[PDB]
Amino acid sequence: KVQQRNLGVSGRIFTIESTRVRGRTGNVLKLKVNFLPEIITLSKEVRNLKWLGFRVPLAIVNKAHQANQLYPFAISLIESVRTYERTCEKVEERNTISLLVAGLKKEVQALIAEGIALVWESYKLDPYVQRLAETVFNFQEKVDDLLIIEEKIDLEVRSLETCMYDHKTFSEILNRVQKAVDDLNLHSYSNLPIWVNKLDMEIERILGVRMVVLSLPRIQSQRYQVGVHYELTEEEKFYRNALTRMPD
Amino acid sequence: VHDKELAAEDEQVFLMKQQSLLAKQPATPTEGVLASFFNSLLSK
Amino acid sequence: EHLEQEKHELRRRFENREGEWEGRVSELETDVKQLQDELERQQLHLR
Amino acid sequence: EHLEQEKHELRRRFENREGEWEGRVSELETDVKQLQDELERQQLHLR
Amino acid sequence: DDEYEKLQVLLRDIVKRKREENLKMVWRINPAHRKLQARLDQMRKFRRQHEQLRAVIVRVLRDAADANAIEEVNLAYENVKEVDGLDVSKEGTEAWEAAMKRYDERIDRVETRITARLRDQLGTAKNANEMFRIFSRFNALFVRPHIRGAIREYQTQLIQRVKDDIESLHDKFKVQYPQSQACKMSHVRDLPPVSGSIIWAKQIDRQLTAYMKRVEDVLGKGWENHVEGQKLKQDGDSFRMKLNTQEIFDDWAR
């Protein structure tokens, strides 16, 4: 069976494959590594059978050695690609955070494209994979953070509808979500002004459903850009416009 | 001026795009201002 | 860049040849082991 | 020049180890051939 | 080694050619100087470690206990020095091994004394600044592995204090520069507002670098990969990127 298969490793490291998934009419394209698990099983069988007196043919042992040469890069590529796929799935789970991972996903896709042109025989594989792995890990970590704090923001939003009508509670809740937005800014998430002004409209709508409100300071977009000489009016500093957002 | 909304492409369209570029990829084997002063002196 | 590629090719060729020779020496050693074992059994059978 | 002399060093090491393995395989081949012919001699002598 | 390899290539070529004249293929070589090579390697490895330890002690332990430890280390070197290191004979090898064992146990005793002093650190120190300065002064001494492993519970305390301080820096930087008293007092002291903002950003950058150096001192070298120093390094990098001032100068010049 092994001689019939005649497995080997060559060519480009990445491949694009079709996979039919129930519920979607279109065939899902996926990025697989050019290293099939059957080669790993072949190497495992070759190295396990040797000590039982089972004389394996020399060509199969040579091919197992060739596969084992590149196995350290292949396993890292496999796990990096799987982590990228799970990161994409996590992003797809929540559609309210897609714009906040534009740069990270773009650079990861750029690295993936750079690696598609790469081949096993090239000498760029050794650093690149490590770089790719690091990038993917950072992406995952970012997305992980981008999930948790965002959920907290949502929780705080849903806590403001039922928030007690007293200035101290409103002030500390808006301070908490402002600190959350500042933390978003610190970790360099793209399109923060878009997401935060959307949150500003949403919380202004909530306050419209709800002087105490008008004295509440607004949620600043980027509280860290200091020294750039720009001014914000009282309307942009507080929810003075909440009087204009009544539903009744 | 509010920044343009940058966004990465979809994974499906991105992979289709990468396949298209792989197909299209053939199988490979494996000063004047300084001069202006100089021009004037030569004429004089 | 071209010389880096060539150095990588020569390095991997050296490792491939080392692995092939290691396998050849291993199988030759096992051939000697089984041959001498059979010789010992047959020498005992002579007596 | 560092890459070039690294390549030449790799070539020299490759040739030297190839010669070592060639010698080892040749002596092993001679040993198994001698043991095979002596084993056949003792087998036909036994009967 | 290189010349012997080059000769061995030629000899293998001759044996392959003149196979009839050379009947066997025995190639074992046991040069007499390899024992001296191993002895010299061992002596070099011992001496570099001892010089590292002695220089560190002379710097950071510059109390009669300090002088006691110093003469203990010097006596260890002297006692190793009495054994003839060049003698590669079996009596010489045994003497060398005994000297190494004696030196190792004496150095371990000195290490225990140093750890006792690093407990006297808390036996004397009261506030966090004093023990910060103590780690700063004793910084090289934690390069040793046993010394580094001795101090484990205080590193977390000082790392949390540095996290509190960099949090305070973050909170200060959240307040915009015109909204801060820095702008008012800079105008009062004749400093122009753009240069005042530049100075404010530069001072925040300087304090960030100082706290990063404090973290390096507390955790020792390789702090970027530490379990607690990874987040600190990431926050420092992002905050330093945000502190870039070139945009202000470009805008003012324009």
Curated annotation (Swiss-Prot), chain B:
Domain of life: Eukaryota
TM region(s), chain numbering: none
Localization in the cell: Cytoplasm, Cytoskeleton
Ranges of Polar residues composition bias in the record: 23-30
Record note on quaternary structure: Homodimer. The cytoplasmic dynein 1 complex consists of two catalytic heavy chains (HCs) and a number of non-catalytic subunits presented by intermediate chains (ICs), light intermediate chains (LICs) and light chains (LCs); the composition seems to vary in respect to the IC, LIC and LC composition. The heavy chain homodimer serves as a scaffold for the probable homodimeric assembly of the respective non-catalytic subunits. The ICs and LICs bind directly to the HC dimer and the LCs assemble on the IC dimer. Interacts with DYNC1H1; DYNC1LI1 and DYNC1LI2 bind mutually exclusive to DYNC1H.
Free-text function comment from the UniProt entry: Acts as one of several non-catalytic accessory components of the cytoplasmic dynein 1 complex that are thought to be involved in linking dynein to cargos and to adapter proteins that regulate dynein function. Cytoplasmic dynein 1 acts as a motor for the intracellular retrograde motility of vesicles and organelles along microtubules. May play a role in binding dynein to membranous organelles or chromosomes.
Family: Belongs to the dynein light intermediate chain family.
Protein name: Cytoplasmic dynein 1 light intermediate chain 2
Organism encoding this protein: Homo sapiens (Human)
Gene assigned in the entry: DYNC1LI2
Full-length numbering of the shown residues: 349 to 439 of 492
Swiss-Prot record, chains C, D:
Tissue: Highly expressed during early embryonic development. Predominantly expressed in kidney, undifferentiated neural tissue and developing eye.
Subcellular location(s) per record: Cytoplasm, Cytoskeleton; Cytoplasm, Cytoskeleton, Microtubule organizing center, Centrosome
Family affiliation: Belongs to the BICDR family.
Subunit architecture: Part of a tripartite complex with dynein and dynactin, acts an adapter linking the dynein motor complex and dynactin. Interacts with KIF1C. Interacts with RAB6A and RAB6B; interaction is specific to Rab6.
Protein function: Acts as an adapter protein linking the dynein motor complex to various cargos and converts dynein from a non-processive to a highly processive motor in the presence of dynactin. Facilitates the interaction between dynein and dynactin and activates dynein processivity (the ability to move along a microtubule for a long distance without falling off the track). Predominantly recruits 2 dyneins, which increases both the force and speed of the microtubule motor. Component of secretory vesicle machinery in developing neurons that acts as a regulator of neurite outgrowth.
Protein name stated in the entry: BICD family-like cargo adapter 1
Lineage, uppermost ranks: Eukaryota, Metazoa, Chordata, Craniata, Vertebrata
From Swiss-Prot, chain E:
Function: Cytoplasmic dynein 1 acts as a motor for the intracellular retrograde motility of vesicles and organelles along microtubules. Dynein has ATPase activity; the force-producing power stroke is thought to occur on release of ADP. Plays a role in mitotic spindle assembly and metaphase plate congression.
Biological source species: Homo sapiens
Domain notes: Dynein heavy chains probably consist of an N-terminal stem (which binds cargo and interacts with other dynein components), and the head or motor domain. The motor contains six tandemly-linked AAA domains in the head, which form a ring. A stalk-like structure (formed by two of the coiled coil domains) protrudes between AAA 4 and AAA 5 and terminates in a microtubule-binding site. A seventh domain may also contribute to this ring; it is not clear whether the N-terminus or the C-terminus forms this extra domain.
Coiled-coil ranges (or none): 32-55, 93-116
Region called Interaction with DYNC1I2, residue ranges: 25-253
Domain of life: Eukaryota
Effect of mutating residue 134 to L: In SMALED1; disrupts dynein complex stability and function
Localization annotation: Cytoplasm, Cytoskeleton
Family membership noted in the UniProt record: Belongs to the dynein heavy chain family.
Signal sequence residues: none
Subunit: Homodimer. The cytoplasmic dynein 1 complex consists of two catalytic heavy chains (HCs) and a number of non-catalytic subunits presented by intermediate chains (ICs), light intermediate chains (LICs) and light chains (LCs); the composition seems to vary in respect to the IC, LIC and LC composition. The heavy chain homodimer serves as a scaffold for the probable homodimeric assembly of the respective non-catalytic subunits. The ICs and LICs bind directly to the HC dimer and dynein LCs assemble on the IC dimer. Interacts with DYNC1LI1; DYNC1LI1 and DYNC1LI2 bind mutually exclusive to DYNC1H1.
Protein name in the entry: Cytoplasmic dynein 1 heavy chain 1
Gene name of the record: DYNC1H1
